[PDB]
Amino acid sequence: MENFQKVEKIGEGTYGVVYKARNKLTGEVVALKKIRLVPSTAIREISLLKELNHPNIVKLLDVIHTENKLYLVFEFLHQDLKKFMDASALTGIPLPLIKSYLFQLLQGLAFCHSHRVLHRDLKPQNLLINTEGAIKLADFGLAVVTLWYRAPEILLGCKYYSTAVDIWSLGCIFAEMVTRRALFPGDSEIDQLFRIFRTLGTPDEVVWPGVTSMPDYKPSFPKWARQDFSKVVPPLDEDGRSLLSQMLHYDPNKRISAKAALAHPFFQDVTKPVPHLRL
Numbered sequence: 423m424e425n426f427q428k429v430e431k432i433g434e435g436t437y438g439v440v441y442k443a444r445n446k447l448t449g450e451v452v453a454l455k456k457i458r459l460v461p462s463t464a465i466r467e468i469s470l471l472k473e474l475n476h477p478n479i480v481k482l483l484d485v486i487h488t489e490n491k492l493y494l495v496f497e498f499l500h501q502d503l504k505k506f507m508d509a510s511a512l513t514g515i516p517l518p519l520i521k522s523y524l525f526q527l528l529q530g531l532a533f534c535h536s537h538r539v540l541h542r543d544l545k546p547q548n549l550l551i552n553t554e555g556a557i558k559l560a561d562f563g564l565a566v567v568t569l570w571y572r573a574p575e576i577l578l579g580c581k582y583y584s585t586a587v588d589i590w591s592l593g594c595i596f597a598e599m600v601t602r603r604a605l606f607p608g609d610s611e612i613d614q615l616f617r618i619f620r621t622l623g624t625p626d627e628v629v630w631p632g633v634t635s636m637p638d639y640k641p642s643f644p645k646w647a648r649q650d651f652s653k654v655v656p657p658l659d660e661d662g663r664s665l666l667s668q669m670l671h672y673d674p675n676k677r678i679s680a681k682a683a684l685a686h687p688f689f690q691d692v693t694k695p696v697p698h699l700r701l
């Protein structure tokens with residue numbers, strides 16, 4: 423760690439704290455994550471991530487493990503998607519750029535999921551962008567906390583959840599890019615669930631076989647009727663609404679995979695625009 427010079431603080435979680443830093447050595451500018459006070463298991467899983475290289479995953483350059491404390495050195499990107507969404511709020515992110523970002527993140531996920539790696543905690547704050555029009559997944563949740571992008575199976579207590587949880591999260595993010603408003607902004611676990619239920623209908627055995635035997639399922643849940651998607655993400659076009667609805671299917675088994683999503687007609691005219699970024 424003597425090799426790095428802190429420049430500024432760019433993040434905090436209960437993983438750790440992240441700094442923009444400069445290799446004292448030889449000026450790589452990097453993001454430096456100082457991790458949570460390290461068991462053998464953590465080291466090996468993290469070393470597995472160092473091999474998970476893809477253009478749409480923030481590159482893990484190095485793992486420094488000396489003295490019990492753990493540091494992760496990443497390629498630095500200049501902005502997160504949240505700040506870009508906030509900056510773009512009056513006009514909205516143009517659809518071609520939303521679509522490009524969505525396609526790229528689905529490519530990232532397809533790759534991760536093909537290697538049996540789940541993100542688990544997708545949100546605007548851990549999607550990072552650069553001037554070239556790339557978007558990248560960061561802060562792989564390698565297991566106040568935001569619940570807004572949590573899949574319903576997690577909220578209902580599924581222990582052994584699947585790659586579909588990331589598709590759900592990404593769907594919520596897609597909706598948010600389009601409407602410029604969080605789809606399901608819950609501030610507790612039951613509020614989050616009930617916000618989902620109010621929009622998508624209270625799930626039952628018809629749309630989600632086995633839902634009623636999930637650990638935190640309660641028969642006493644209020645029974646809300648589903649709303650139509652034309653109300654939920656106007657003025658998104660039919661292709662986009664079709665894709666979104668498949669990304670938000672209650673049953674993780676019916677939820678569209680990253681790979682199948684890339685073949686959706688919504689991406690027929692996909693391009694790679696450059697965002698105008700003010701750094």
Ligand SMILES: Cc1ncc(-c2ccnc(Nc3ccc(N4CCN(C(=O)CO)CC4)cc3)n2)n1C(C)C
Pocket residue numbers: 432433434435440453455480496497498499500501502505547548549550560561
């Ligand atoms: C967690 C984590 N692990 C590694 C990274 C990472 C990797 C590569 N590049 C970055 N760059 C960032 C991240 C965040 C920000 N902004 C966050 C929001 N912000 C604030 O001032 C918030 O108050 C401005 C900086 C700028 C560059 N991170 N991160 C990010 C998501 C904080």
